[PDB]
């Protein structure tokens, strides 16, 4: 039943007595459910250290992974170029999923096409699919560029992207001069960040490999910036802003910031902003190329160093105080521009916030996960704050990255109780936060389920989730935040300290029980 | 618009396509004629999507794992293959359930074999067997395992049926291999068919020789309701208030036990014909269980469906049906009195998967709202046959509409409201047109039954009449 | 007892069994406490409508007020001028409290001096205190200006600020040319915003009243901006940024943004930034003066219109979509500068966020309080979002402001269930949120206590607090936020929608009870 | 720094003042000589603040309402006057208590008469009576009312004593008028004295003719502990583990009933001598209750205080004291072993109100830390007498220090840590010097007793050795 003045959605409509009785009847009559005591016993067992030992012995089963597949990152990279259509050669279900994923994270339209490879192409290949798809996409959506990636079906079949695109141009399906960069993005290798790397390397190669004769390093007085797989629009914006304050000429290659933040003004813009083809063609003429996320831009680094002859600096992700300082100093050295007073004042204000919040931040234990560069920057910043990143999970991390993070942890007294896990999923992390409980979790929306599980053990065992990373589905407009630079450091610090204070307020809100510590001033 | 105007709009939109694409897409757009009963004379459906046209369709894996098998709560479903398919479909569909997640229920979790390069090169059958052993170790309370194949499984020559047979015999466990590779078929529809066949071959006949279940003459099974935001619970409360005993729910909040008990029911009540007509026909042909389609969208369709269902039973069920209708009449009448004046005369364009584009029309009309355009991602010609009589004259019908086609149709028709999926929501919101997610109910609902109708009316009013839609033009640009 | 590896602060140290037993012994033996059943009965009574009727019959008693006294606002206004020392003629306890209040809100040094008026001055007055204090302050802290306000003691005994300062200059305690603007700020009239208004009018009078002969309106191509009592640094920053994007010459009079956000770089800066004396002297030459918070800038408006002959536009606070649009259009009309494409895109992005979050924001009921202009801007924005501001409290509001807010509410269907209260404190609001429960509260940190009270009635009766306003003591760095303009509207929208989503996640986190609605995607 | 260097620093700092201010401030700065017992020979205190020098001192209202009367939980305290004084002091002090706020406890609430212009012009006695009636209506479980006067009350000629008497007789309620107007005195110290006098005249003698309370030979009262972060509870658990019965706590987590029961105790244990020595002397002279000062800051002072207190009782109390000391020895020894190596040799400067500048020195020394400068906002010369022997030789002593003076002293001395209030915290944090709030314990604590010592050591280590202090210099500068 519903009262028209106060209509109930599913929660709390299904908490009504009639719905409770009907659900109980269903369960008792037809579900053959295990007894509640057995369910409680099994849950308690899953919270134990023996279950953790069994869980970490997994070799074939993956439960709740913390990574996606390559073509997602390829699509995100392709979206960063001017009037460019992402085109995934393969089956259409992949493109539907990619678009839904990005739509839910960004709350924006995400344009991407498929050539709809089916059982017919499973034997003969998708050459005809490629020809028809390129022609149809160019005719219908009118892009200036079509950036081609692949699904797992095309990779397993062994479709030659280069030959297929060349045949499409040779038979007149698309004009010869039309730019169609391509990249093989096998979903069974790496993760979404690997797809971003492969797509960017393919685009850069397409635009620069055959015209290196007239290129002179440093002849345009600019610095190339490659952001990598990035889902915070504030990060693109802060990098561009910081480079503009220094008066440093720059080219942000793969800039999807405009197309992912189009205004609602009565018209739909399929394309907006992005790196131009002229910018990519002129990229070898830059002074140098800076990779914002070097740990998943290794193929891009190899191409840039071997072909453009750019001496790519060994820089960490500009996250937190020290690494933002190093990024700014390296940019100053490359460009010859001094670091302005505005950036010095911004750094000082970040340090002031650190000194203001250090008492609440000190000693706090964290479990965190995400992409390798983001996770490493978060660990570095947490160490700078006096926090303890006790659990550091990176499902798509490798051994060299783990060694680098271990070196970072060993350099700080606050990394003593920290452990880095690679190839582990969020079920491993659930076991870790049960057996060795941290104060908070930092990660994407999937960690919310872990929080629920911890709350099921008890309020004192609950590990609250702090939503930083990708994807964030259960909150609105967090994709507008910043994690890079001093601005991103201040935002992360504010989020952390206020999460701590919110948790303390919740724990001390009990009248005459714990509210003696419900302080007005914190 | 008149019929000639709609035809001219269709031709103008098709003008941009190449000759082959235009010729193919001309067959998937039509002007509705309610008197037509054979929709294949006016529209063609269930065909291959044209390459590179930004289709909204999914894959067979989405239709099997994401739609049919996934809602089954006490079973563990393995996305066999690389990580992407399982990751993108994890908890994206609001098929609600009651259970302890990770202990006895596993709907919102993502189990995957996470194929690497070596699994592609050398196969993943041994990996699948080891994964099944690890699943048994770490989740002892699971009541069954399904193995949903992703694209590489059918291309590398893996034999998941033999692995399922051997491991099921060894562990005395139901292991259902589903060959739902994404490249199979043209959309989620073949995924529905493959999942139905897997249910038939591996689960449904489990209790054929079992007679311990105590059957009653009022035994019904809800087939094809996936409890989106609790829709199946809203339907079930009405059915049980009518004196019926709902033995099974397929498959929202569904357990494997009630699926096995379904062949014992007296009637099958099919909500989604598209996804479960195969298993309904199989049960009719094998166990002799009649099945009937019903609609619980809006008070009018709900009342008609309740009366039709009660007509299949004795007089006591009919009397209880009249009592239920009388009880719920004031509530939905109050909902109409409150919200119809705010919504009367508004025009709606819908584009959903395979059932709802025709099922929600009655609910929209109960609020005085006119559906001027509708279409399906993956419906067959029988769905369009059912759609002709529900749609108004000279209304627009689209099958597997492209993004460009939908945008142009919306530009010309200019509806007051659009109901579609997440991939069109922000496109049409940026155009200044109110949008309602008709898959996930915009994270609201349920919409089935009278309790669902109240929420449906509130949501349509809150989105259509929101102040934000009057602010898209800056005052220095009026 | 304490374990050295895990040291407990007061919470949860005093939850230990020995401390619980000792507290119980103290209560049972010596406190003569009322029985717990009587306490519960009285609390339940205080949650009722009869108690609300008794509570709203108050005429003399004020409980938990939502306002401060005038000299606090005077000090905040004085801090906005270059190298200016706030100087409160009166007793020193007032200055200690003002400094502590601002230190806790801003987490920054707050410089302010007193002349330490004692019982000796309670009869003869504080003329000698004024002379010695002016001399000592100028000698010691070396300001370029001393802005003088008053405490209640000096107002009650009737100290003549003008005569005292003139005598100080006549006897050589301070140079004659040294600027000493003054304002009478009686704490028994108005509130802190009235003190801000009085101090600004005094400073503007001091710098412009006697030199109006050579002033020509509009001769410097600038627009004067008077922000009023403002405690969000982001508001100053966003106003300056928006005016800079339009290419509009402006003078922000009383700009305390720099001095309240000094960097931590190893040195203490007592003064930083601020409105210069030349800016104040040249203010009558502006095209016009825009008052950001007109409802507590009435005396300033009277002076600006009557002396500077500026036709001050009738503008609301630039909060939310419509009022930001009106502010920008009026600025464009005054300055002749068109509204640039960047601001149009920003407005469109705010509208896009509104369309994205409208489903979660629609129909939500709010109790809110604060200063009149901030409160009315928040009410306007909530109406634009489809929210319901059911309780609108302004302790320092007047009848004309209440009439204006009622007119705003009547123009929107979402203001049907809204009631505006003036002269009511937070005990009245506690009664209101008990008897007519809203979904959320928007206000300063004091509302946290109200939240505690609601939680004591039950979890289903708890009204969570959303911290927007002044002062915010229990969270860190929220003073850096923005509430004005499109940027402030986006920040407020994000805070509101994510508070709603956090509450929904908390309510649906119960495993097998309410977690059927614990959706990954919202 | 040697004595001559400290004197030269004092003179250099004083050079900037005008002649009158310099002459006055020269008497409030000194170089410590531990052999000196009469501190008035070297430093002068409890004087008027110099105008316009940014003093840190508060007012008599802060010393009475904010310090003494406010912590009393079952009483309602009316800030009589305009809204500001009550608003700024509301819940700013962490005097912890147990109760149901708004029902039977009212510490964190702000009750005020909210004086308007008409109240100033025509008086507020009728308004005060109406307010008392409304308080009785809306808060029936309050066990008493105090009326803390703000500045205008003593200037407009209001008679709150007559109103208090009439309304108390009418309602059979204890109504305590406190003439704590801010202009009275020079600091919070006169507020302490006025509040003590109000307690003496209106509350303390309520049960003089009552003999129903069952007294024991081990009855003690805790006087001058305000339960900052639970400090009084940490002291009380130790006292009761020693076999004593803590009848009253003054005034943190204090009720009016235990204040009335205080004249029945056998011993008074005064923590804050500055704020409650008046009432301690009154109780000694009237009821014959001896009072003794004790210090629970750090294990050494805590052990010495426990032994001294137990020496006032029989042998059973002494045996229980030895048992308590033995029980708690491993815990504070582990705390020292963990944190002293991180803090050994660090130099700290303190500036707090009237007790803690000398009381916390032992706790710092237990961690190997050296106090090189100390000073008081409002202490008297007896406090400095007690401070001489606790401070090291050639250390700096400052009374009512100005912001400029403190900044210059910190610049020259360069301590590793500064302990002061909220009005100096951000100044010294921006200078790159770790700062600990020594009033509110930086919203941490308690610091009293053995349990408080662990928190104190952890806090000092976390602030002094925080990484943030090594990052204030940009690498390009
Ligand atoms: S009462 Fe005094 S200023 Fe003795 S007014 Fe002050 S809670 Fe200080 S050094 Mo704040 S004489 Fe207490 C004090 Fe000491 S408020 Fe606290 S810390 S031990
Ligand atoms: S059509 Fe369907 S969703 Fe596509 S793959 Fe095929 S079953 Fe799956 Fe999977 S990991 Fe990523 S998302 Fe693909 S490229 Fe492969
Ligand atoms: S020294 Fe002390 S704090 Fe000062 S007034 Fe006097 S009792 Fe009070 Fe009060 S309302 Fe504001 S803060 Fe004053 S100017 Fe008056
Ligand atoms: Fe959006």
Residue numbers in the entry:
A (entry chain B), C (entry chain D): 2 to 523
B (entry chain A): 4 to 480, 493
D (entry chain C): 4 to 480
Question: Could you share sentences copied from the article?
Answer:
Nitrogenase catalyzes the ATP-dependent reduction of dinitrogen to ammonia during the process of biological nitrogen fixation that is essential for sustaining life. The Fe-protein mediates ATP-dependent electron transfer (ET) through its [4Fe:4S] cluster to the intermediate [8Fe:7S] P-cluster in the MoFe-protein; the electrons are subsequently shuttled to a [7Fe:1Mo:9S:1C]-R-homocitrate metallocluster, the FeMo-cofactor, within the active site of the MoFe-protein. The active site FeMo-cofactor contains a [7Fe:1Mo:9S:1C] metallocluster coordinated with an R-homocitrate (HCA) molecule.
MoFe-protein was separated from alkaline acetylene reduction reactions, run either with ATP (MoFeAlkaline-inactivated) or without ATP (MoFeAlkaline), by size exclusion chromatography at pH 7.8 (S.E.C.). By cryoEM, the control MoFeAlkaline cryoEM structure at 2.14 Å resolution incubated at pH 9.5 closely resembled MoFeAs-isolated. We developed a method for the quantification of HCA extracted from MoFe-protein samples using ion chromatography coupled with mass spectrometry (IC-MS), revealing that while all MoFeAlkaline samples analyzed contained approximately the expected 2 moles HCA per mole MoFe-protein, no HCA was detected in the MoFeAlkaline-inactivated samples.
